[PDB]
RNA sequence: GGGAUGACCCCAGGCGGUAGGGGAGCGUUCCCGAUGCCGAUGAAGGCCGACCCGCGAGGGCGGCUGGAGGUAAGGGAAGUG
RNA sequence: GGUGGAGCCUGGGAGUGAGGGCGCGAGCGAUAACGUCCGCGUCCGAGCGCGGGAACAACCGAGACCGCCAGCUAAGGCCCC
RNA sequence: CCGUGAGGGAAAGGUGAAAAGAACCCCGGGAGGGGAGUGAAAUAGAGCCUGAAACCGUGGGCUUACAAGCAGUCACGGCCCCGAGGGGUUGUGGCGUGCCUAUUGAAGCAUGAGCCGGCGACUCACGGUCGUGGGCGAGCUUAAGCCGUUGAGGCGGAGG
């Protein structure tokens, strides 16, 4: 049985024991979160209108951190214009328990 | 610098670069540009800024109460530990560092050789040296004398 | 009171070295060509990394107009069908249920081919 | 165990001895003297003398029998430079490098 | 998650007549099925493509003049080498070669759609050797 | 004439590239029978002056 | 808007950019801080680092080298990149 | 009406005073020129950053703070590349 | 050292606390090295403190002989290393016109630069003019000097 969520303005496929990065979450570690739905599947199949009424998707917030530094470099030629920045991105990585639908 | 001034190689044909002489900065052992000379950094603050400087310095430490007076030192003749003596009875033990500002030679010989003693004719006593210091101590005479210049 | 250059400028130039590092000839081993060089991958990253996000729907979509076409209709036809009933699943998930899940995918089809 | 010998400030030309030391690397002690010997070039007098100087140390002072002995290690690094003058024409000079070179070699004992 | 990325696939093998079919308008189908573009799990960078067998390839058909007006043509490297040649002759010379020129510039270009081509086999005729591989043959 | 020079330095791996074909081919040597010590082919043996089985020189 | 004031929090909007204006910072030499603190259980410097904090310039941590110097919070002055 | 990186005033610091393509209105030119000289505007200049235009500073689209293996669109496009 | 001559004008410092500066033996003509020995340290061995970068070489891992290219970036896959992750490498697919300069406009077949390391360019004094943190305020301020100090400050009203 497996399920496609949606947080983050991104949708993922989830199952029971999935470590899933997904954007950070106002969430305190430790605490469980429910996810909206859009589709249920593997044993009996039901598709989401956009979503579906009462299931959901309970997960356990494993914690909070920062994805490695990428390197946003911008510059222009013949112009003297460099720039360098770090950025890590933000993320929550989540536990899936349970598919309650 | 010490080159002479010829036109190291000719303006042009060389298939070198322009030069003149060796003496230019651009070269090596040559001249420096806009390095330093002799200057006056010395320059005229405004007395009332340090007649009331000194004023202010002297306070604060009476704030921390860390100033102290005496009428004379008692028992002092030119040795050290003639002081140390006296400052122990006066409660100067040693861990803070001391102005002692006074007219009496043989006080100020005493003790200047200390770590952690500044030594001062009061006609002299100025503000760095107080904040310099954790404590501050005078004669009634370099009290007085003190008075009689910020007043 | 005289300040050269020291110990500033050489590690500056360890700096680009590194982030060279593994760059064809001089370009790892030269300081000025590992500038010039980390001049560009530093614009062609953050060039593709925006790019990625096009890469794969593109790709995406190349799976599942294939899948789409096993039941008798193109990508085109089924992308209005799951509008028109109101399906919000998403090219990237579309794109593996067409694989890993193909009876889920085949309703999905289904449910377009009538919601026109 | 190793026994090595280093022929340093060698005047002569290092990609010039390479070409004889590559051509030794790896083989027996007798199969590099056999090689060493009838190689037509210069180089030959330097990597040879070398060759036995270590085959002397290994033998001598390493206790390390001449007969298990194989080249394990060759390898010719270059030294300072003469820097020698050579008045082309019209009053230009140039520089020449006169090149010195630094052969070292080890051997070791191909038990069996 | 991660986009899905197939393991080494078995290839298949189609059988493709020509006969009456349209030039470029079957080059099309087979090139699709090279790049593998049928398959759900397509994937840009491997072969993961049919094998294509095309046969009665001197039967295709064309629209207009063109056996008279197509100019197939090459540049033997050295001056006045360019070599005009039309449709009409190409097949009764070398006809195979209509139809795999044809798909070969409906192929991508560099490494992978070069060994794309090479899974490209166009024979004129009825037959095939290809026997032993029992291909899938495709009606398009 | 016009003085023709190099329009750019050649890599490492340029020169390296063309120095494919400067090994050197390791001399021909073979065995005197009568003192089996290695030498080349064709030639009077330095070792013991031997040269078709028979003596020719002083050694 | 909170709260009262740059405490951090929420809502909204701005942020392509040469010449050029402006602002806030890093880093190098030097002075007070210093008759102090760090240092042979190893200073400065040098080679690696996939770890830490910083938008970044840069700052720490660790390992190898190195073998007698270095220098904090806070300020001052320039032969300062 | 309009609260906008709008406007007025005083004051400090500049750079610019070699522009170019396009569109419309003219002159000059041959109802020539990637020609030239003015006027309103636009763009490149400084957006040689992005999409389209096969490829191309200025034609069409659109004003790039940063990150996503999410969605909708503009010009332009949907047989294969 | 250059110049007939006036004249021009360099480069070049450092072992170690102490020479205790490597007896003797071994390969070699020697140079040089290999053990022994000294030393806390000998890739501190006199061609010596630290020893960076270009540059050269030896061994190892990945990779390459139907490919095309400002050499890199993104995704994936295979092999190697380190112990749902990371590091090195590169086969394929996508994309992609160096840096600086001067230009209306350059990848630009316009200029400069082979490469690396160090020197290398907006300062100073007086006067002026805005801004600014302070001190005093119809008042503010001293200059040369005199005394003091020996990194002590105070006096000095002429004058502006
Ligand atoms: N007695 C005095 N006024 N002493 C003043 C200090 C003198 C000198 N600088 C010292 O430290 O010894
Ligand atoms: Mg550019
Ligand atoms: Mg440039
Ligand atoms: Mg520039
Ligand atoms: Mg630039
Ligand atoms: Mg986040
Ligand atoms: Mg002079
Ligand atoms: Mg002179
Ligand atoms: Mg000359
Ligand atoms: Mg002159
Ligand atoms: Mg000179
Ligand atoms: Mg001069
Ligand atoms: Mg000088
Ligand atoms: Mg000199
Ligand atoms: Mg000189
Ligand atoms: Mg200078
Ligand atoms: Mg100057
Ligand atoms: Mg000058
Ligand atoms: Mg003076
Ligand atoms: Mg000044
Ligand atoms: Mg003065
Ligand atoms: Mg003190
Ligand atoms: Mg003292
Ligand atoms: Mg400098
Ligand atoms: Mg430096
Ligand atoms: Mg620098
Ligand atoms: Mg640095
Ligand atoms: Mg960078
Ligand atoms: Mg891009
Ligand atoms: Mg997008
Ligand atoms: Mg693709
Ligand atoms: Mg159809
Ligand atoms: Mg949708
Ligand atoms: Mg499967
Ligand atoms: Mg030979
Ligand atoms: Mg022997
Ligand atoms: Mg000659
Ligand atoms: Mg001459
Ligand atoms: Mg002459
Ligand atoms: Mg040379
Ligand atoms: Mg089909
Ligand atoms: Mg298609
Ligand atoms: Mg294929
Ligand atoms: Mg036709
Ligand atoms: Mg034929
Ligand atoms: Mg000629
Ligand atoms: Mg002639
Ligand atoms: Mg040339
Ligand atoms: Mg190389
Ligand atoms: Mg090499
Ligand atoms: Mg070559
Ligand atoms: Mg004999
Ligand atoms: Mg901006
Ligand atoms: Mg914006
Ligand atoms: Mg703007
Ligand atoms: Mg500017
Ligand atoms: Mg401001
Ligand atoms: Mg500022
Ligand atoms: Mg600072
Ligand atoms: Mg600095
Ligand atoms: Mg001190
Ligand atoms: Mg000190
Ligand atoms: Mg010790
Ligand atoms: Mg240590
Ligand atoms: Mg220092
Ligand atoms: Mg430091
Ligand atoms: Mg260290
Ligand atoms: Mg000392
Ligand atoms: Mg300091
Ligand atoms: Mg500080
Ligand atoms: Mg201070
Ligand atoms: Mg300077
Ligand atoms: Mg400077
Ligand atoms: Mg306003
Ligand atoms: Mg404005
Ligand atoms: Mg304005
Ligand atoms: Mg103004
Ligand atoms: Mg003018
Ligand atoms: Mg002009
Ligand atoms: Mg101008
Ligand atoms: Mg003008
Ligand atoms: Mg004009
Ligand atoms: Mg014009
Ligand atoms: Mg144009
Ligand atoms: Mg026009
Ligand atoms: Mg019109
Ligand atoms: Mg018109
Ligand atoms: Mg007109
Ligand atoms: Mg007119
Ligand atoms: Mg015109
Ligand atoms: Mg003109
Ligand atoms: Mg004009
Ligand atoms: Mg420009
Ligand atoms: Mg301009
Ligand atoms: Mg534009
Ligand atoms: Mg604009
Ligand atoms: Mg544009
Ligand atoms: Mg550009
Ligand atoms: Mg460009
Ligand atoms: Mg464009
Ligand atoms: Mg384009
Ligand atoms: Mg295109
Ligand atoms: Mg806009
Ligand atoms: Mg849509
Ligand atoms: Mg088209
Ligand atoms: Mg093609
Ligand atoms: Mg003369
Ligand atoms: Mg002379
Ligand atoms: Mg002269
Ligand atoms: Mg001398
Ligand atoms: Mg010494
Ligand atoms: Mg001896
Ligand atoms: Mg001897
Ligand atoms: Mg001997
Ligand atoms: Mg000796
Ligand atoms: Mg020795
Ligand atoms: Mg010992
Ligand atoms: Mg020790
Ligand atoms: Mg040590
Ligand atoms: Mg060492
Ligand atoms: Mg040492
Ligand atoms: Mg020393
Ligand atoms: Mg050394
Ligand atoms: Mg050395
Ligand atoms: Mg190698
Ligand atoms: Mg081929
Ligand atoms: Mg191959
Ligand atoms: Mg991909
Ligand atoms: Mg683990
Ligand atoms: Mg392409
Ligand atoms: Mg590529
Ligand atoms: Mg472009
Ligand atoms: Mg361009
Ligand atoms: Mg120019
Ligand atoms: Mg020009
Ligand atoms: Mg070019
Ligand atoms: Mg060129
Ligand atoms: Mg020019
Ligand atoms: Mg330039
Ligand atoms: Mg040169
Ligand atoms: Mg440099
Ligand atoms: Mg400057
Ligand atoms: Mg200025
Ligand atoms: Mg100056
Ligand atoms: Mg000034
Ligand atoms: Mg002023
Ligand atoms: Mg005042
Ligand atoms: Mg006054
Ligand atoms: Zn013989």
């Not at chain 1, 920045?85 to 990585?93: C, I």
């Not at chain 3, 500033?8 to 760059?23: C, Q, S, T």
């Not at chain 4, 019209?90 to 070791?108: E, N, P």
Request: hydrophobic share 40%.
């Amino acid at each position: 049985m497996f399920a496609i969520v949606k947080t983050g303005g991104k949708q993922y496929r989830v199952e029971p024991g999935l470590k899933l990065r997904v954007e950070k979450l106002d969430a305190e570690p430790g605490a469980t979160v429910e996810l909206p739905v859009l589709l249920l599947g593997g044993e009996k199949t039901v598709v989401g209108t956009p979503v579906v009424e009462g299931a959901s998707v309970v997960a356990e917030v494993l914690g909070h951190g920062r994805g490695k530094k990428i390197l946003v470099s911008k510059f222009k030629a013949k112009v003297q214009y460099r720039r360098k920045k770090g950025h890590r991105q933000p993320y929550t990585e989540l536990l899936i328990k349970e598919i309650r639908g | 610098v010490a080159y002479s001034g010829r036109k190291i190689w000719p303006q042009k044909h060389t298939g070198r670069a322009r030069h003149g002489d060796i003496g230019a900065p651009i070269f090596v052992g040559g001249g420096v540009v806009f390095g330093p000379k002799p200057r006056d950094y010395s320059y005229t603050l405004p007395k009332k800024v340090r007649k009331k400087g000194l004023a202010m310095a002297v306070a604060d430490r009476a704030r921390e109460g860390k100033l102290l007076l005496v009428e004379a030192f008692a028992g002092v003749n030119g040795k050290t530990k003639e002081f140390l003596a006296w400052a122990k009875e006066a409660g100067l033990d040693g861990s803070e560092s001391v102005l002692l500002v006074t007219g009496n030679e043989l006080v100020r010989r005493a003790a200047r050789n200390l770590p952690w003693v500044v030594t001062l004719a009061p006609e002299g006593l100025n503000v760095y040296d107080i904040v310099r210091t954790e404590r501050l101590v005078m004669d009634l005479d370099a009290w007085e004398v003190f008075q009689n210049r910020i007043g | 009171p005289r300040a050269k250059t020291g110990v500033v400028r050489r590690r500056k130039h360890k700096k680009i070295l590194k982030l060279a590092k593994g760059y064809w000839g001089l370009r790892s081993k030269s300081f000025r060509k590992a500038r010039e060089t980390l001049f560009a991958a530093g614009n062609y990253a953050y060039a593709h990394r925006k790019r990625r996000k096009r890469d794969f729907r593109r790709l995406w979509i190349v799976r599942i107009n294939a899948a789409c076409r096993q039941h008798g209709l193109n990508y085109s036809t089924f992308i209005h069908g799951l509008k028109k009933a109101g399906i919000e699943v998403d090219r990237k998930n579309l794109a593996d249920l067409a694989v890993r899940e193909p009876q889920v995918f085949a309703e999905l089809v289904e449910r377009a081919k009538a919601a026109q | 165990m190793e026994a090595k010998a280093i022929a340093r400030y060698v005047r002569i030309s290092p990609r010039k001895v390479r070409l004889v030391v590559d051509l030794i690397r790896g083989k027996s002690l007798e199969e590099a003297r056999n090689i060493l010997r009838y190689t037509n070039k210069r180089g030959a007098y330097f990597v040879a003398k070398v060759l036995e100087s270590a085959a002397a140390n290994a033998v001598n002072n390493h206790d390390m029998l001449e007969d298990r002995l194989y080249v394990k290690a060759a390898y010719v690094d270059e030294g300072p430079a003469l820097k020698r003058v050579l008045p082309r024409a019209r009053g230009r000079a140039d520089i020449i490098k006169k090149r010195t070179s630094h052969i070292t070699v080890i051997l070791g004992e191909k038990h069996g | 998650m991660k986009t899905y990325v197939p393991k080494q696939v078995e290839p298949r093998w189609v059988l493709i007549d020509a006969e009456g079919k349209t030039l470029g308008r079957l080059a099309t189908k087979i090139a699709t099925l090279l790049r593998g573009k049928h398959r759900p799990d397509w994937t840009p960078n491997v072969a993961m493509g049919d094998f294509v067998v095309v046969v009665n390839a001197d039967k295709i058909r064309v629209t207009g003049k063109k056996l008279e007006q197509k100019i197939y043509t090459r540049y033997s490297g050295y001056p006045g080498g360019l070599k005009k040649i039309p449709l009409e002759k190409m097949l009764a010379t070398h006809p195979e070669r209509v139809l795999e020129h044809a798909v070969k510039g409906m192929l991508p270009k560099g490494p992978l759609g070069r060994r794309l081509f090479k899974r490209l086999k166009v024979y004129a005729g009825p037959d095939h050797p290809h026997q032993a591989q029992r291909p899938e043959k495709l009606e398009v | 004439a016009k003085h023709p020079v190099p329009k750019k330095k050649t890599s490492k791996a340029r020169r390296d590239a063309r120095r494919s074909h400067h090994a050197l081919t390791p001399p021909t040597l073979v065995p005197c029978p009568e003192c089996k010590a290695m030498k080349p082919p064709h030639t009077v043996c330095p070792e013991c002056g031997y040269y078709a089985g028979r003596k020719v020189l002083e050694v």
